[PDB]
Each structure stands twice: as C-alpha cells, then as structure tokens.
Design goal:
This is part of a larger assembly, with chains A and B.
Chain A: no helix or strand
Chain B: E1 2-5, E2 11-15, E3 38-40
Antiparallel strand pairs in B: 1-2, 2-3
The complex binds ligand TQN.
Ligand TQN binds next to loops of chain A.
PDB class: membrane protein
Keywords: bacterial flagellum LP ring salmonella, membrane protein
Entry title: Salmonella LP ring 26 mer refined in C26 map
Chain lengths: 58, 52
C-alpha cells in the first residue's frame, strides 16, 4: 500500500476495508399504564309506622 | 539502527551513528545531529527527462 497515513490521528476507519469495534450496550425500557373508575350509589327510604287519624287519608 | 519512513509508512532510510550535541545561554542537550548518519534504502521514481 502506497497510501498516506497520519501519525497523530486516532486511526479511525477511513476506507471500505477498514474495521471498527462496536460496543452494543443497548438498553431500552418503555412502560404505559391507565385506569378509570366510576361508582354511584343511592338508597332512599320513607315510612310512617304510625299515622295520625287526620292523616290516614294520604 | 532506526528505520526512517515516509508518510506512506515505507522504510526509506536506515539511521545509525553517534550523536553530536553542543558542549547564560545553555545548549540544547536533548537534541542532536548525526552527519551522514542515515543511508538511503529506496529511490523515488521521477519523471525527469520525460516530456518537453
Ligand atoms: C318541582 C315542583 C313542581 C310542582 C309539583 C306539584 C306537585 C306534584 C305532585 C305531588 C303529589 C303526588 C300526587 C299523588 C296523587 C296523584 O294524583 O298521583 C297518583 C299517582 C302518583 C303520580 C305522582 C307522580 C308525580 C311526578 C313527580 C312530579 C314532581 C314535580 C294518582 C292517584 O291519584 N293515586 C291514588 C289512587 O290510587 P290507585 O291507583 O290504586 O287507585 O287512589 C288511592 C286511594 O285514594 C285515597 O283514598 C282515601 C280513602 O281511602 C282518601 O281518604 P278519605 O278521607 O276519603 O278517607 C284519599 O283522599 C284524601 O287524601 C283526603 C284529602 C286529605 C286531606 C288531608 C290534608 C293534606 C294536605 C296536604 C298539603 C300538601 C302540602 C304541599 O285529600 C286531599 O285533599 C289531599 C291534599 C290536597 C293538597 C293540595 C295541595 C294544595 C297546595 C298546598 C301548598 C302548600 C304551601 C305551603 C284518597 N287519596 C287520593 O285519591 C289521591 C289524591 C286525591 C286528589 C284530590 C285532592 C285535591 C288535589 C288537588 C290539586 C293537587 C295538584 C298537585 O290525594 C293526594 O295525595 C293529592 C296530593 C296533592 C299534593 C300536591 C302539592 C302541590 C304543591 C304545589 C307546588 C307547586 C290513593 O292512595 C292514591 O294516591 C296516593 O296514594 C298518593 C298518596 O296518598 C300521597 C303521597 C304523597 C307523597 C308526595 C309525592 C312524592 C312523589 C315524589 C316521587 C315522584
């Protein structure tokens, strides 16, 4: 090979045949949450158990 | 016997010999010169003599 080569550079790959080292160190994490609620409660009462003579009509 | 190479990483000379260094302005004692200390090994092709 007659190609020029720098002395002080970091010897990065530059041509087709050059080799490079890859450190994967891949780490991905995704999360998703959702919630919903709805509560309705009702309860009504009414009773005499004793009615006046004048109110017995109703 | 240090090999002297060009920018192409090719050995173009071989250097070996004795260093000569100078013996308030003190001389540089970490740098010396060797006269005729390197012998060439390769010859660079040239176009000289070709063309007009
Ligand atoms: C937002 C506001 C808007 C305004 C709203 C207006 C009022 C909106 C309306 C509210 C009133 C509900 C109407 C109920 C009667 C009705 O029409 O709808 C019924 C179906 C229900 C639909 C309602 C959906 C509304 C939908 C919701 C709408 C809401 C908006 C059909 C029906 O008719 N079903 C019917 C049938 O059943 P069956 O199907 O099986 O056959 O027959 C059986 C057997 O009949 C009984 O027999 C008895 C003997 O056996 C006999 O006694 P006896 O003496 O003879 O012995 C006895 O006679 C008697 O009461 C004798 C005598 C009693 C006098 C005692 C003193 C009481 C004073 C009491 C004074 C009241 C004080 C407020 O009378 C009356 O003078 C009644 C008083 C009149 C007051 C007038 C108000 C002046 C304003 C005074 C104002 C005061 C100012 C401070 C006989 N009673 C009857 O006939 C029935 C009827 C005879 C009508 C002739 C009298 C003149 C009416 C003249 C005109 C009336 C017109 C309305 O009386 C009533 O209640 C009428 C009540 C009216 C109140 C309105 C208030 C207006 C405010 C005005 C506001 C603007 C009944 O049981 C059954 O009726 C029952 O069960 C009813 C039960 O009792 C009573 C439960 C009440 C609980 C509250 C409701 C709770 C319900 C809630 C859930 C929905």
């Amino acid at each position: 090979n007659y190609g020029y080569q720098p002395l002080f550079e970091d010897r990065r790959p530059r041509n087709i045949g050059d080799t490079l080292t890859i450190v994967l160190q891949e780490n991905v994490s995704a999360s998703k949450s959702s919630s919903a609620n709805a509560s309705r409660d009702g309860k009504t009462s009414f009773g005499f158990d004793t009615v006046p003579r004048y109110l017995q009509g109703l | 016997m240090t090999p002297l190479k060009g920018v192409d990483s090719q050995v173009y000379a071989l250097a070996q010999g004795n260093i000569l260094v100078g013996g308030v302005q003190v001389n540089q004692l970490n740098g010396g010169r060797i006269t005729n200390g390197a012998i060439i090994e390769r010859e660079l092709p040239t176009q000289f003599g070709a063309g007009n």
